Structures are given as C-alpha cells and as structure tokens.
C-alpha cells in the first residue's frame, strides 16, 4: 500500500552501534618545505605514523596547530634565536 503526510521525528535509531567513524586530522606532527611549497604533517586519527603524509598549507589552513607547534620545534630542535 501507501501513505500520505510527513513529520520530522527521531528518538532512537540504533542501540549497539556508534554514530559514525572516519580518519580526520588531529594535530600537526611536523613542518617542512618542498618544491617551493610549504608542506605540513597532519596526524590522521585512526592510523599510525606509517599513515603520516605531508600536505600543502594552501589547501588547508590550521594556524592553531602551527602556532603551538612552533614552541615544540624550538625545544625539539635547538639552533638559534632570531627574536
């Protein structure tokens, strides 16, 4: 058969199941440059370091990860101070 009329409602869909899962960036793991292009290392959740790949900064803007990571690069790599 068939039916008419609609209504927006939702109280429960599943019990022994999660909403959704996927591999999304978490935070910066490193920073470098290649072919005159600034590349950044994004930690893709749900994976290991083996799945660590560099990406263009022009494609993704994350000044929140770099701003903080900047302090990590200093402690991690000791060189000089140009302040």
């Amino acid at each position: 058969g068939s039916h008419m009329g609609k209504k927006t409602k939702r109280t429960a869909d599943s019990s022994s199941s999660e909403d959704e899962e996927e591999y999304v960036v978490e935070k910066v793991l490193d920073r470098r440059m290649v072919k005159g292009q600034v590349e950044y290392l994004l930690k893709w959740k749900g994976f290991s370091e083996e799945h660590n790949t560099w990406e263009p900064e022009k494609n993704l803007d994350c000044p929140e990860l770099i701003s903080e990571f900047m302090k990590k690069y200093k402690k991690m790599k000791e060189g000089e101070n140009n302040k």
Side-chain angles (χ1 to χ4, degrees):
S2 41
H3 195 51
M4 63 270 296
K6 59 93 91 168
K7 204 195 194 176
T8 33
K9 62 89 163 185
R10 205 274 288 176
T11 63
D13 43 275
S14 59
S15 165
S16 197
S17 297
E18 208 151 68
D19 285 347
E20 198 172 83
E21 74 192 316
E22 195 154 16
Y23 315 107
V24 286
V25 53
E26 207 289 288
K27 68 188 282 87
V28 164
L29 269 176
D30 260 300
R31 174 188 183 281
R32 276 208 208 161
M33 295 152 61
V34 286
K35 310 183 88 277
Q37 183 182 60
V38 187
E39 261 203 330
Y40 282 89
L41 209 303
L42 300 177
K43 187 218 150 199
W44 291 110
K45 259 212 111 61
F47 277 127
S48 300
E49 59 267 305
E50 62 212 68
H51 294 267
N52 291 14
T53 171
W54 308 76
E55 282 307 287
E57 180 65 17
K58 51 172 79 271
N59 178 31
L60 50 92
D61 55 272
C62 283
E64 276 272 316
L65 300 177
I66 312 177
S67 161
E68 272 300 305
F69 172 53
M70 273 156 129
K71 171 140 177 185
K72 303 278 88 153
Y73 213 114
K74 288 186 174 283
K75 185 155 88 176
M76 201 273 224
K77 272 287 276 87
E78 197 167 9
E80 64 269 307
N81 309 129
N82 48 43
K83 53 172 167 79

